[PDB]
Design a protein around this nucleic acid. Structure first.
Lengths: 119, 122, 53, 211, 115
RNA sequence: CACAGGUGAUCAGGUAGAGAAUACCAAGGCGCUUGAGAGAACUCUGCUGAAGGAACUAGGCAAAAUGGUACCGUAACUUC
RNA sequence: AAUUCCUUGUCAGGUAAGUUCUGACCUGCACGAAUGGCAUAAUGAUGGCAGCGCUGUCUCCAGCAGAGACUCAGUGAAAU
RNA sequence: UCGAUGUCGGCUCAUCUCAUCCUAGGGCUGAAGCAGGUCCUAAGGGUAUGGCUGUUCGCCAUUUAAAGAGGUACGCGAGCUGGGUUUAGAACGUCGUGAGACAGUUCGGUCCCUAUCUACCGUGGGCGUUGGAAAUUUGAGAGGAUCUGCUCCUAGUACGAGAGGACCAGAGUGGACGAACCUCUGGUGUUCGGGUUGUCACGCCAGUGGCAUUGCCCGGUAGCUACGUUCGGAUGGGAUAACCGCUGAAAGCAUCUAAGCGGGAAGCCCACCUCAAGAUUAGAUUUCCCUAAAGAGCCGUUGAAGACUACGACGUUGAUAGGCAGGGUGUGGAAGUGCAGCGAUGCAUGUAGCUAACCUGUACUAAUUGCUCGUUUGGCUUGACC
């Protein structure tokens, strides 16, 4: 059973999925629009939106938490310089997922993850 | 929870120091004996020239367990060892001194002297 | 592990009967007026009158 | 023998003045609106039909909407029925209310519910089959069912054989459960025991037949 | 909080005031004891190895050594058995759960005083 | 067979380390030619497990356990 | 007794309980001296028995992690 | 049956018989009572753990109400094991000149198959049920369950020379089994929080991250879970088994039987729990709709529901999921700074920082009134009403 359990497995180890979602969060914060698998997109919110929520307030400790959970200094700078200020007064829901058909190679359902507000 | 082939310390002055459970009494397929339950034990190590000798088969009552005993309020009361008290062929204590504390589950009629001889009753 | 007598063609077709191809639902975006799968964005990229790009 | 429909809110404990733990479950009791009274003449048997909770109009069909409007009650999240006799149909007319004061403190009740579904489960769990040896040469039969029949005679598996199946998510009735407390104003009933099902599910509370 | 609001309403009445205390500090607890027709209070003094806070269901475990063998009891904070609790001595522990003390017997078991 | 097998010699970086063991890295090279989901029984490989501790079993099979350096100390027997 | 059929021979030890194990007796079905006799320190992935520690072997199984099983898309056997 | 029907034992899983081991009801007794012995009725449930030995068996120890006798390919290896027997090696005793042999012994010695059909355990699709649909349901019938100890009281009474010690009634509390459940006690908790070893890296200090079984270690949220909690096995109805009768003739008597009327068991049928109209005999009730209607489905957000299904909830007339807000829980004192200390390190800012799945709210994000299926009053005969 998985009663009330959350999270994903996605056929990966714990460290592997953590690293993959860190990579996806960085790429999403960089390009503001990324094409990905639909489960991956739905799980990406749970790890990306909280970083924006924390970046709403700029401080050394908050920036160090962001760097601990992202491991890209350029992109921590971007998150605390543009996404935080842009998203200061928005209560959540910082990503919109737009389903975009099925993948050619394996027929995996696909979606577009777009940062709200001109991504 | 005491079952067959469980080592118990001896909590009285009967001369035995360690006993082994060979039968949990009071049921066709009874598994475990808690505090206040009667068991059959073999004496595995006794003091020299004591009342009881090594290898003797006799009765005992469990007086404290590491698993613990539950109370009506939902609390649990545990001990650091499993200890029982040796008994007669009529299931009466054969002890003049009780070592270590016991619980109030021994309250009744056949273990009242164990309760009264224990240094402390929880 | 194996058959004792070869399965018949009718019996084989009876199992196949349930297998069926899925047909995707179709909707037309008002702004762009193009066929697209239900709850899935258009080829062009116009979804519910919004610009993805 | 008429009962009531409630919602399981979860388990808690009640302390007695003597210092005794009473594990209880709290069932939310919205007023049960009588939607139909069944009788021997029209139906051939006697029963009370009730509705509880709330349902939005978009989810209430025209047939159910008319059925509710006949009684004059607001649509609930389901329609339930209780077998009743002449004594129990005494004062219960269509459109009436059944509250938690149907049950008084200290009496025995039977609670029916939909038990938590474990999905498709093996013999070891569902039927309490003994596990085979983990070691000593065991290959692929640690949790295997084992033998299911004898030989050519009979040469068939007998009906009712215990085998891996879906476990849970079935109607389960528990009897001889006391009622600790009743609150009409808050519409909540507190019942001793496990009260089968999960929290948030619908539970049927009836008087105990054994009494 | 974790429980439903209807359950919380019932729990609030059961809640009873009691001195707050921390982990790892020596405490004396008064426990009601029934000897038949008479009532008595028994004093249990020990270091608190472990504590769990669950609102009404809060429980703390007290460990004391009697006649060379330790005794552990998981007392219930809000139960009516516990007439009173007082803190004889206050100690500082790095971790809430002191499950290493069970192995410790004498000089090691002691906990440093907190000022 | 674009096969988890076999195939002699030669070169032998850094930090720990007795070490060509083991761990993480350098130069260099790779992610091993089906993927995406779900997270049922059951199978395989592993982790943890209250109390008991061989009661298992043909049998302590398997697992568990011990594990280094320095010092102290070490029995019967002995071909010393 | 790697040798004993009767046989689980008898006695003693070990266990609460020992067709196995140890010591002894000799009634050796059917030992016996280079197809070597009896012993023997050391050695042995050797046979048997008994202990400490240790534990999911077990009482009695529970939870968790990964690879399959299951669903979708591509490729596509087998014995019979 | 030799163009192959796998042996003994063990494990797992069972099913049936009664020539009944316990429980249940009786007759007789060399039945005073307690305990028994024999036989009759009764198969509803229950009917142990270990030492030895490959054992079935058997002996022994300790229990139990009891540790029943049997059939099922001496049930069960396309379910597991492989200790014995029954290959190939080696050795002892014995036999044979020898190769070799021994229901003599001893050490060692590859157990394959992805399930087509029947059967069984679950779960769906199709159509049917005299128009269609949304719900609620009656029950022909089927399955589950059926166990029992001990203590007290009656009463140390009846009985008995003593010893001992009740039937019938009543109360309590256990053992085994089963169901549900996670409030309590625990286990687990590889997207929680900390401590720490080696190494690499983030330009460096600091602070962090990768790998080394989750690197190791200490705790722990929800969920699941037992060893934890709650509950159940009914003391009721009907007809009976053995047995005991009332009245009563055949047979002036006697006689439970031939007519008639009774008592009587854990057994039979109900009662309890679950399923149940594919019960083609397809039932019943309340509503809704009929020139694509009422509804169903697809699709989307999804659930203590689930392999896929199905089921449950919701889709802007919204709290369905995620995020977010406030809490709760867990860990235990974040970073920065300052102070003390030569330093490791300690202290204050401050129970701080972080916190999965938990609780309550909140449309910020995603759930598009889009498409498909489904109609147009439901044949005929008879009868009552009209």
């Amino acid at each position: 059973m998985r009663h009330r359990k959350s999270g994903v497995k996605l056929g990966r180890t714990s460290s592997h999925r953590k690293a993959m979602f860190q990579n996806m969060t960085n790429s999403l914060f960089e390009h503001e629009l990324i094409k990905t698998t639909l489960p991956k997109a739905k799980e990406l919110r749970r790890v990306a939106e909280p970083l924006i929520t924390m970046a709403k307030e700029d401080s050394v400790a908050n920036r160090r938490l962001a760097f601990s959970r992202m491991r890209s200094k350029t992109m921590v700078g971007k998150l605390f310089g543009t996404l935080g200020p842009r998203y200061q007064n928005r209560p959540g829901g910082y990503l919109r997922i737009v389903k975009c058909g099925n993948r050619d190679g394996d027929n995996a359902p696909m979606a577009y993850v777009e940062l709200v507000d001109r991504d | 929870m005491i079952q067959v082939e469980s080592m118990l310390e001896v909590a009285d002055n009967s001369g035995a120091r360690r006993v082994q459970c060979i039968k949990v009494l009071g049921g066709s397929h009874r598994r475990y004996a808690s505090v206040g339950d009667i068991i059959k034990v073999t004496v595995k190590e006794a003091i020299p020239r004591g009342r009881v000798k090594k290898g003797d088969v006799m009765n005992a009552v469990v007086v404290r367990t590491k698993k613990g005993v539950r109370r009506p309020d939902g609390s649990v009361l545990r001990f650091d060892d499993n200890a029982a008290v040796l008994l007669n062929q009529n299931k009466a204590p054969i002890a003049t001194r009780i070592f270590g504390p016991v619980t109030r589950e021994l309250r009744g009629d056949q273990f009242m002297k164990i309760v009264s001889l224990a240094p402390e009753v929880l | 592990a194996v058959q004792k007598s070869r399965k018949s063609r009718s019996r084989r077709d009876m199992r196949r009967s349930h297998h069926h191809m899925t047909v995707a639902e179709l909707s037309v975006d008002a702004t762009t007026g193009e066929k697209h799968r239900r709850h899935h964005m258009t080829k062009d990229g116009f979804y519910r009158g919004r610009q993805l790009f | 023998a008429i009962g009531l429909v409630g919602k399981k809110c979860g388990m808690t404990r009640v302390f007695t003045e003597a210092g005794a733990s009473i594990p209880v479950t709290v069932v939310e009791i919205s007023a049960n609106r009588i939607t139909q009274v069944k009788n021997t003449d029209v139906d051939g048997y006697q029963a009370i039909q009730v509705t509880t909770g709330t349902r939005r109009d978009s989810r209430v069909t025209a047939a159910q909407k008319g059925h509710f409007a006949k009684a004059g009650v607001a649509a609930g999240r389901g329609v339930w029925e209780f077998r009743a006799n002449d004594s129990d149909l005494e004062g219960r007319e269509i459109g009436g209310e059944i509250l938690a004061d149907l049950f008084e403190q200290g009496q025995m009740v039977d609670v029916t519910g939909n038990s938590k579904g474990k999905g498709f489960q093996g013999g070891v769990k569902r039927h309490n089959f003994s596990m085979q040896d983990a070691t000593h040469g065991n290959s692929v039969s640690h949790r295997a069912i084992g033998s299911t029949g004898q030989n050519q005679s009979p040469g068939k598996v007998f009906k009712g054989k215990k085998m891996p199946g879906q476990m849970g998510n079935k109607r389960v009735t528990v009897q001889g459960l006391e009622v600790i407390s009743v609150d009409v104003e808050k519409g909540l009933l507190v019942i001793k025991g496990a009260i089968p099902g999960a929290t948030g599910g619908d539970v049927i509370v009836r008087p105990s037949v054994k009494a | 909080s974790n429980k439903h609001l209807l359950v919380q309403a019932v729990e609030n009445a059961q809640i009873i005031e009691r001195p707050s205390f921390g982990p790892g500090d020596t405490v004396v607890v008064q426990v009601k004891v029934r000897e038949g027709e008479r009532e008595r209070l028994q004093a249990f003094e020990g270091i608190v190895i472990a504590k769990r806070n669950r609102g009404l269901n809060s429980a703390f475990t007290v460990r004391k050594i009697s006649s060379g063998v330790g005794v552990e009891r998981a007392f219930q904070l809000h139960s009516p058995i516990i007439e009173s609790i007082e803190v004889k001595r206050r100690g500082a522990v790095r971790r809430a759960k002191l499950y290493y003390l069970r192995e410790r017997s004498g000089k090691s078991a002691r906990i440093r005083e907190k000022l």
